[PDB]
Ligand binder design. Structure first.
Ligand SMILES: CC(=O)N[C@@H]1[C@@H](O)[C@H](O[C@@H]2O[C@H](CO)[C@H](O)[C@H](O)[C@H]2O)[C@@H](CO)O[C@@H]1O
Length: 141
């Protein structure tokens, strides 16, 4: 699949073929100053945003932390949080999502940040969306 170049945010785009084992999605962007306090990347089914297999949500609030969770039929499950923010505003970053049979491997600038085991079959994911206080340079597959 061709990369989405300079997509505007918010953004929603189809992931051709749907998520598949071995697929690596790269999200290159920059956290802005003066927008909001958080941004997110969502691996979802459809554009509704009601069913999100994997929600990666960095929050520049309360000291800085990232929320990882799944949303099924509009219902958010138990959150997984990490308190060591690997993001810095005004600095471009490479957010890499490696899809494996049992989990998502998430790397920030080549450094493994989190591991999220699939709560729902990843084959159900065909859409990636990004919103919040972030500017995108590109999304590659
Ligand atoms: C401490 C705690 O459980 N707080 C939660 C909030 O995180 C939650 O905010 C939502 O969180 C989901 C991901 O779990 C999405 O990021 C969503 O955009 C947030 O609004 C709220 C609402 O569900 O519930 C508690 O406050």
């Amino acid at each position: 699949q061709a990369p989405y170049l300079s997509p505007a945010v918010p953004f929603s785009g189809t992931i051709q073929g749907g998520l598949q084992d071995g697929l690596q999605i790269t999200v290159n962007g920059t956290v802005l100053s003066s927008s909001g306090t958080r941004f997110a990347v969502n691996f979802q089914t459809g554009f509704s945003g009601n069913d999100i297999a994997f929600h990666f949500n960095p929050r520049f609030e309360d000291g800085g932390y990232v929320v990882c969770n799944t949303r099924q039929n509009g219902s958010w499950g138990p959150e997984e949080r990490k308190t060591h923010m690997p993001f810095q505003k005004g600095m471009p970053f490479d957010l890499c999502f490696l899809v494996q049979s049992s989990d998502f491997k998430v790397m920030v600038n080549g450094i493994l940040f989190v591991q999220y085991f699939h709560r729902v079959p990843f084959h159900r994911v065909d859409t990636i969306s990004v919103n919040g206080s972030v500017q995108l340079s590109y999304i590659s597959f």
